[PDB]
Amino acid sequence: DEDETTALVCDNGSGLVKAGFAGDDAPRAVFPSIVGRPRHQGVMVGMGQKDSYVGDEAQSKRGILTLKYPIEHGIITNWDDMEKIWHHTFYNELRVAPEEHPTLLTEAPLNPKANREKMTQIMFETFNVPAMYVAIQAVLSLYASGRTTGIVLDSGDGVTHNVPIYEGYALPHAIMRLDLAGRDLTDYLMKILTERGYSFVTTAEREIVRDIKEKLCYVALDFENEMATAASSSSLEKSYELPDGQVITIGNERFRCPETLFQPSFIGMESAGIHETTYNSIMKCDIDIRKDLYANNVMSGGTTMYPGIADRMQKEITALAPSTMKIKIIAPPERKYSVWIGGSILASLSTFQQMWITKQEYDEAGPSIVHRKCF
Amino acid sequence: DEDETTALVCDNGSGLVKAGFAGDDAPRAVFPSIVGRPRHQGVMVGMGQKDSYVGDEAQSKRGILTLKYPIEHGIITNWDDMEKIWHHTFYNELRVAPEEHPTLLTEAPLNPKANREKMTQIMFETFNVPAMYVAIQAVLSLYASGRTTGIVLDSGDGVTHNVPIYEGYALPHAIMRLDLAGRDLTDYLMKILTERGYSFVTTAEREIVRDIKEKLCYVALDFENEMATAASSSSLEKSYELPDGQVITIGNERFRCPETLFQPSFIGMESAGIHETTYNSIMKCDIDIRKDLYANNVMSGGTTMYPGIADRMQKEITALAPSTMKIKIIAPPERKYSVWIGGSILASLSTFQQMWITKQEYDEAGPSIVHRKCF
Amino acid sequence: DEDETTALVCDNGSGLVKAGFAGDDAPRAVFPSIVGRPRHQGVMVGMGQKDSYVGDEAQSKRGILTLKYPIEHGIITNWDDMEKIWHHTFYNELRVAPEEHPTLLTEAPLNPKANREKMTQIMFETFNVPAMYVAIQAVLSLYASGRTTGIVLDSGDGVTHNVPIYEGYALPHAIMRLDLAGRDLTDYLMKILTERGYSFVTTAEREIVRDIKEKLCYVALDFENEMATAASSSSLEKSYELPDGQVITIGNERFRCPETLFQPSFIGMESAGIHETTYNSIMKCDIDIRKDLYANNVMSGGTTMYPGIADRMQKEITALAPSTMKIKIIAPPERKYSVWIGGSILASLSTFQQMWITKQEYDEAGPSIVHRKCF
Amino acid sequence: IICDLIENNTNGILAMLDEECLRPGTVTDETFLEKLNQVCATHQHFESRMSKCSRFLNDTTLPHSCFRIQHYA
């Protein structure tokens, strides 16, 4: 089938499956991490109509399905559904046999270890890969940045990290994990669109709210004067055509969605915000690291494609950090993919080929071997 | 109100307010050093519901508050919040007027002197005590031990000292101060319980993690064979019922919490550990003191109620100190209170009544008088 | 590689490696005597990142290292680490082969003789130098002064000597060795900056405290009126920008650091001070030497670059020595390097070429030959 | 073993060069020589100056920022 030993870089952070080959620019198979299930009976005889719809095919039929993300906040909930996602990933979209290729998974730090361990157990026992590795999402986000020094903000669909790394060495004590991410912003956006007058309650309607969040939101550099501006005039009211008919027109909801990311008191989650978890992750580091963390602050995962979020980020960290510091919020426009791109780089290095957790070494010490080889 | 001139012994080391009268066995008012604040709006009209919850009353309502320790690592951060703690201390819990009683504060050595000076300024200007003193925590921990010779380990919530004292004379050059204490062990325990699978992120959840640390931890006399034992079987797995529902079951996290206290490389804080700060504080002393420091090593503050910590302590100092020495780790089971008890003894001595920093002597030389009368 | 037989003058007194060629003005390779070691794990694959950082390269990465001076108070503690320092000294910084060049080491008087003997053993067995010599630091400090008569104060990082020499003859019975030097002043400065409010506990932070000591200290000619002056006004408060952010402002700590050198009771070390070890080293000499020791008192090593220390020195020895004596504290501003400069002079003399401890004479009587040829 | 010294997918010279070209780490020539000294100097017929091993000696007409390969020629 395949005449190569190219490593597979499979990457489900929490909300969007992206996969491909090692040593490649763009991820080959990008599709949402959903499994579908018909919530009512079928009538037409002779249709096919299996009781599983995974990936973008589920979004073709999302009107008649109960959509269900199998992984939540980076934690895999239903292992059978995630096995459907992986089966559709390798066998249908990417269309390659896992038996002949090493695999490079990704996860979050501060993960429940049964996710990592059972993920390795499914990768070796079911799909029978020859090699396997459990990559950290944020470190790979620093691999695609072309740097070896920087603090990493990625903020995927269910997790954000702010992992500081200095000169090839990470700082595991200064690590962070906040559970405020894009799915919570989608639920809050659904709540405030219910406040305006557009009632979205279905999971398919929740997917439409995610579409409105992706297309039509920005970050509000100064939230107070932007709030008074939205209360002032209708220069911020924007119409978005929903699928099948009625258009919407959003005002202050256009920028109160990512302000929740910068201020978690709107969603009532006790936290300090993104800009203070960065500053706290810098202040937990030592004294002689911090200007290298200021000049190389990376903001290159998902949920950062809101326009001007680097201006709010630099404008706020400048207010937090002491003066005469050069706050460089590195936002390369290739983000939302840079964790896969760092997967492609790290899977294509020459030094990495003796760090593979491989079979006959998996079977030697069982599934706990990941906690002694990987990290 | 009170027909006595009994001195007040108020003792906030860093994490637990204990206060009472001079010449008493048990501290009368013991409550945690927290101030509460409702992080969201109120709805019910006619409730009371003031915007301040201090002491154990805050732990009655900790689900709806943002808990905030006003003193951190022995350093007072918010003077208004600590003034709320003192106001609740004298006027509500202990229920006595500060105007008619001398007061005996406590602090850490190697303190920023604005803590000592502004603490004296608040005690004279606001509460208007007639007399005041700034006691060292570790020296009072040696007063309750009934000795005049010994090296003192207390290890409160934010500080540890190892103050060596020989025959009534302290050794101020051989003094130590390590910032690794029980609150950092609480944060590390929260991190490794996140590693097991129980996610605690709220300050109230952090208080629950502090409860699990107090109830269900021991010291692991030999950490390597205890680690292999926890990796071997489930004889160490213990279930603890959380408040409101789901029980937990901890394994190797039961003893990796105080091993961080004996090995600060787990929390990434550059230090030598408790057992080597003791030995370094002994080796900084002179030659003809050390067997009196070996026979009278005191371990009588907070965060030492872990079972068998005297066995790990003696078992490690025996490996560090030369042979034919009698390493007597004195661990009187009245600890966590012995700094207050030494406050009660020292406040009840006959010689002490001309060492009070008093009013009309405070006003004579201003707030700097503490740096010439006290120490 | 090198077309010369120029002797190597390698000089680690206790705290700063300076090395170069014979017959030269400035030392060619000057770098701090530290070895680095990463105290936590590495993450980035493909970095290099060896487990050794020596010299100023360690100060490039001191945020992620545990810095460790291999030589303490002039006594070499770890021979492998000092072998790393010498290997980096000859092979990387100075960049010359030791096989073709004689070497001129330096040490302290009243040294443990295993330092001298094992130092000669490492110089002949490992690096295979043809010739070798063990120079006294203070005598070389008198060679760079251009004199043959004088008492020598150098006060390096770990040792001070006060070696009196009259007309080519030293006085070995009147020799002194006090273990109070610049590293103890760095630790005391770290202690009193902890007293002000700036907490430094890391070895990298200790290096920052050493930087503040080098840049921003003076000697306080009269310590009592200078202490009342610092207590009077803020004309002595000086701000120093720390690396990465927060500035500091020191007051009486600006001059209480070298007063500890003139008064060891502040650090609790039982001694007489520098000014009384000089006067005791003069009074141990005979009667007809002393005005030649008064007119030629040399103060030309490290830790004497504090401004006005010659005024405190002459002003105090004038109070100790009898009248009608001319106390000339010779402080040539080329100090901190004059022990290397005297190494360059003494290694370039014509008479010295039959005082080399050489190979085939080392092998004749073993490593004890240094105690019969050198001194 | 000269061919193997150059072409090995984990320990060869061209694998290290493809590594240094592949990853960006602000890479230069001396860092690449540092990598060759790290992983490629465990072989007998490789020869460098900073490593030690292969070879221990301080051989003249062997500068820095260079390396020797003992070819068939």
Ligand SMILES: Nc1ncnc2c1ncn2[C@@H]1O[C@H](COP(=O)(O)OP(=O)(O)O)[C@@H](O)[C@H]1O
């Ligand atoms: N252009 C965009 N604007 C705003 N949000 C976006 C945009 N693109 C993606 N997102 C959000 O980012 C999340 C996916 O981020 P990503 O890091 O790819 O997830 P994963 O953790 O699966 O890798 C989705 O919830 C989506 O709503």
Ligand SMILES: Nc1ncnc2c1ncn2[C@@H]1O[C@H](COP(=O)(O)OP(=O)(O)O)[C@@H](O)[C@H]1O
């Ligand atoms: N039984 C126990 N087991 C383990 N830890 C305890 C126990 N009791 C108290 N602690 C810890 O000791 C700390 C309080 O120490 P203490 O010295 O009383 O504080 P303070 O500095 O306020 O006097 C608390 O943070 C608590 O976590």
Ligand SMILES: Nc1ncnc2c1ncn2[C@@H]1O[C@H](COP(=O)(O)OP(=O)(O)O)[C@@H](O)[C@H]1O
């Ligand atoms: N300009 C300066 N001001 C004050 N102290 C200095 C200055 N320069 C160096 N020092 C101190 O002198 C010490 C080095 O002295 P030196 O005699 O060079 O050491 P060594 O014994 O290695 O020769 C260092 O610890 C440093 O703190």
Ligand SMILES: [Mg+2]
């Ligand atoms: Mg992601």
Ligand SMILES: [Mg+2]
């Ligand atoms: Mg205490």
Ligand SMILES: [Mg+2]
């Ligand atoms: Mg010196």
